[PDB]
Design a protein around this ligand. Structure first.
Ligand SMILES: *[C]C1=C([C])[C]=C2N=[C@@]3(/C([C]/[C]=N/C4=C5N=[C][N]C5=N[C]=N4)=[C]/[C])C(=O)[N]C(=O)N=C3N([C][C]([O])[C]([O])[C]([O])[C]OP([O])(=O)OP([O])(=O)O[C][C]3O[C](N4[C]=NC5=C4N=[C]N=C5[N])[C]([O])[C]3[O])C2=[C]1
Ligand SMILES: *[C@@H]1O[C@H](CO)[C@@H](O[C@@H]2O[C@H](CO)[C@@H](O)[C@H](O)[C@H]2NC(C)=O)[C@H](O)[C@H]1NC(C)=O
Ligand SMILES: *[C@@H]1O[C@H](CO)[C@@H](O[C@@H]2O[C@H](CO)[C@@H](O)[C@H](O)[C@H]2NC(C)=O)[C@H](O)[C@H]1NC(C)=O
Ligand SMILES: *[C@@H]1O[C@H](CO)[C@@H](O[C@@H]2O[C@H](CO)[C@@H](O)[C@H](O)[C@H]2NC(C)=O)[C@H](O)[C@H]1NC(C)=O
Ligand SMILES: *[C@@H]1O[C@H](CO)[C@@H](O)[C@H](O)[C@H]1NC(C)=O
Ligand SMILES: *[C@@H]1O[C@H](CO)[C@@H](O)[C@H](O)[C@H]1NC(C)=O
Length: 497
């Protein structure tokens, strides 16, 4: 009942809001499928405000408010909600122009970024110093603390590992309200727990991100296949350890035949002439699906850079088996490539097709069963439907993941990131997509495929235990008991709430 002085001070300064405008904005997310109103929203102006909130919660017998840390709210199923609790509007930590919330190291070996900062700003600040993070996410308008609480993957993860494998240290305020700086050498238990920890142990206020000298441009290429075996074999060849090959980025896409021409055109990569040739190829092979590897080779402004890239690319391509003559090239500034999805957002939003339900299906599928997944899903379940949204598929190397961290991955040395990014655009098409997702998961369970979901929150304890693995689960729980004893943090994950 009584309020600690530092907590009341937050309300007095207008940082704790309970108005419908504040609570409503913090009640929905990108998923646009689930929603939950919090009792209040906190707009912290410094990390001290966060210490005050968490300290109050930890020292107040009977504290009944769960606490969530909202970054950009790109969660899909309410992971950033605090039902009847307090949602922290993390962005507020960056309202002040000084002191800066992003500082590139004096020696240019790393960049310190506030947990609330979005990667697009981290990128700009880094480039201003001639450097840039090594591992990214496909979309840059996500927060550092947000992607780090999951894993943070993209086409560079095969060689640099996810974003959680590229963090030197962090400042974290635990459920106890204590500010702790952690790394592999200090408070490593908290360090490993928080990375991929789904916001269960504390709030990341600062993350030290590893960087590399910034490349100036990216030779961007797409290779087309009608044969999945060749497609996957080539992705594995390009991402296999040698130390890794030349490619800086490697992803893949699945195009179902029904809407082939339209989807290829909507990639913003192919010309109408390219599209016509690919459509013709599909008909010739009588394919129900077309596959495309997407890769890049980063290079700088050196006078001989462009020519070197042409030779390097020619060599790499010579080792592949895409359909003869179906290699397509583009050349753009590094930043433009990295922020490519923002353009897709702008276009979709104008059409009112961005802010719609997103029943996205994301999972890691062991290499040994990816061909079965292709048969049962791409060539099976998905056939006959009108797909809206990209179907992304690409291999990852387990060697670049730290299994000591909270993030869960399949046991195999190589596993695929499979992201079926369905957009519910048609009238009331959501129910159909949700059922289709359950069917896909059912197919995998019955086939005995040992996949791991990503960005999904389970609603049954047995599912979370299987997710992390029993032994790893006990470790997760031990860290929960040590850092969030009252089980108040990020209740939307539905692990301890
Ligand atoms: C929305 C979204 C988008 C748009 C994107 C993305 N991305 C990603 C993926 C992929 C995708 N892709 C795509 C594409 N391509 C081409 N085209 C296209 N389109 C679309 N898309 C997924 C699937 C990438 O890339 N990668 C990854 O990995 N991921 C991603 N994503 C997802 C994310 O990451 C998530 O969402 C996260 O979460 C982040 O976000 P944010 O917003 O930042 O956050 P939130 O939601 O708010 O939250 C979450 C959680 O956590 C926690 N926290 C926060 N913060 C913090 C924390 N803790 C501690 N500390 C701190 N600081 C909370 O509480 C919760 O629980 C995507 C998406
Ligand atoms: C970035 O560097 C600045 C200094 O160059 C840091 O600024 C200090 O920030 C703390 C709280 O974050 C304040 O109490 C100090 O008054 C600030 N001092 C200065 C020099 O203004 C800032 O913390 C750093 N942030 C990052 C990205 O780690
Ligand atoms: C790939 O999809 C196209 C349509 O997107 C199919 O072509 C249609 O086929 C029906 C029945 O054969 C014809 O009546 C239509 O006139 C065709 N439309 C087009 C686009 O020309 C094609 O059959 C599909 N191919 C495969 C292998 O599934
Ligand atoms: C072109 O591809 C289509 C689709 O793979 C072939 O038609 C399939 O034929 C099998 C066996 O006859 C059926 O089980 C499928 O249902 C058919 N596809 C669908 C869903 O319509 C077709 O035979 C191929 N053309 C040839 C003979 O080369
Ligand atoms: C979904 O988004 C629409 C429009 O953006 C909004 O009217 C609706 O309240 C949202 N529903 C949920 C569950 O977020
Ligand atoms: C690379 O060259 C472009 C155009 O000349 C320039 O804008 C950019 O700053 C250069 N990259 C570096 C070294 O910052």
């Amino acid at each position: 009942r009584p309020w600690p002085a530092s907590l009341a001070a937050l309300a007095l300064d207008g940082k704790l809001r309970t108005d419908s405008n504040a609570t409503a904005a913090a009640s929905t997310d990108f998923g646009n499928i689930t929603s939950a109103l919090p009792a209040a929203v906190l707009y912290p102006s410094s990390t001290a405000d966060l210490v005050a909130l968490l300290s109050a919660a930890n020292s107040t017998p009977g504290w009944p408010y769960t606490i969530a840390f909202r970054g950009r709210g790109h969660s899909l199923m309410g992971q950033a909600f605090a039902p009847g609790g307090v949602v922290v509007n993390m962005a507020s930590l960056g309202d002040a122009a000084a002191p800066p919330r992003i500082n590139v190291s004096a020696d240019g070996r790393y960049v310190d970024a506030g947990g609330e900062q979005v990667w697009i700003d981290v990128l700009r600040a880094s480039l201003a110093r001639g450097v840039a993070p090594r591992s990214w996410t496909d979309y840059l308008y996500l927060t550092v603390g947000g992607t780090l609480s999951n894993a943070g993957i993209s086409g560079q993860a095969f060689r640099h590992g996810p974003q959680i494998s590229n963090v030197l240290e962090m400042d974290v305020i635990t459920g106890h309200g204590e500010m702790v700086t952690c790394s592999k050498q200090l408070n490593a238990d908290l360090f490993d727990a928080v990375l991929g920890g789904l916001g269960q142990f504390g709030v990341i206020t600062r993350a030290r991100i590893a960087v590399e000298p910034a490349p100036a441009r990216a030779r961007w290429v797409r290779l087309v296949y009608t044969d999945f075996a060749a497609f996957s074999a080539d992705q594995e060849r390009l991402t296999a350890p040698r130390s890794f090959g030349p490619m800086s980025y490697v992803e893949g896409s699945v195009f179902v035949n029904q809407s082939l021409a339209t989807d290829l055109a909507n990639t913003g990569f192919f010309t109408d002439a390219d599209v016509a040739r690919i459509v013709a190829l599909a008909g010739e092979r009588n394919a129900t699906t077309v596959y495309s590897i997407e890769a890049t080779l980063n290079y700088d402004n050196a006078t001989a850079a462009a020519a070197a890239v042409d030779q390097e690319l020619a060599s790499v391509l010579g080792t592949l088996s895409y359909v003869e003559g179906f290699a397509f090239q583009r050349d753009v500034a590094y930043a433009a490539f990295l922020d490519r999805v923002h353009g897709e957002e702008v276009a979709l939003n104008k059409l009112g097709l961005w802010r719609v339900p997103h029943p996205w299906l994301n999972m890691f599928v062991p290499r040994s069963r990816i061909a079965d997944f292709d048969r049962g899903v791409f060539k099976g379940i998905l056939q006959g439907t009108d797909i809206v949204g990209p179907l992304i598929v690409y291999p990852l190397n387990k060697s670049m993941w730290d299994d000591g961290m909270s993030a869960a991955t399949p046991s195999e040395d190589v596993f695929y990131a499979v992201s079926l990014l369905f957009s519910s655009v048609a009238p009331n098409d959501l129910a159909r997509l949700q059922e289709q997702n359950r069917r896909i998961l059912r197919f995998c369970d019955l086939a005995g495929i040992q996949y791991k979901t990503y960005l999904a929150r389970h609603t049954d304890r047995s599912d979370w235990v299987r997710h992390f693995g029993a032994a790893k689960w006990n470790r997760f729980v031990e860290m929960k008991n040590k850092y969030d004893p009252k089980r108040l943090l990020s209740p939307g994950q539905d692990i301890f709430n």
